[PDB]
């Protein structure tokens, strides 16, 4: 019936706007926490290399 | 932390090589100075025995 096809339309419009959130910060935090962990790891690498050669490794 | 166990290893290696000296001459000199003193003592014994018997003692 036409009234049924007037409520189908009235629910499609509702379920098409459910305040979809932006997933931008929630991922840049992950990127940042990857970089920070990587740096804290690289520090271990550097300080072990010094304890090998009494010198931090040359660049490149 | 792993870095602490990288410096413990770096100090154990240092304190395991401190140029340990050879104690060979420093003891053979003592042995020699014992033998020399003994001989200088035996000379007194011999020369007293002669002043007893007008003759140095027979061997063995």
Automatic annotation (TrEMBL), chains A, B:
The keyword Transmembrane applies. GO terms for biological process: pilus assembly; protein secretion by the type II secretion system. Signal peptide: none annotated. GO terms for cellular component: membrane; type II protein secretion system complex. Its main location: membrane. The chain crosses the membrane at residues 1-20. The keyword Membrane applies. It is a single-pass membrane protein. Keywords: Membrane, Methylation, Transmembrane, Transmembrane helix. It is found in: Membrane. This is Geopilin domain 1 protein. It comes from Geobacter sulfurreducens (strain ATCC 51573 / DSM 12127 / PCA). The chain holds residues 31 to 90 of 90 of the full protein.
């Amino acid at each position: 019936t036409l009234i049924e096809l007037l409520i189908v339309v009235a629910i499609i419009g509702i379920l098409a706007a459910i305040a979809i959130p932006q997933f931008s910060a929630y991922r840049v935090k992950a990127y940042n926490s990857a970089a920070s962990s990587d740096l804290r790891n690289l520090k271990t690498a550097l300080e072990s290399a010094f304890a090998d050669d009494q010198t931090y490794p040359p660049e490149s």
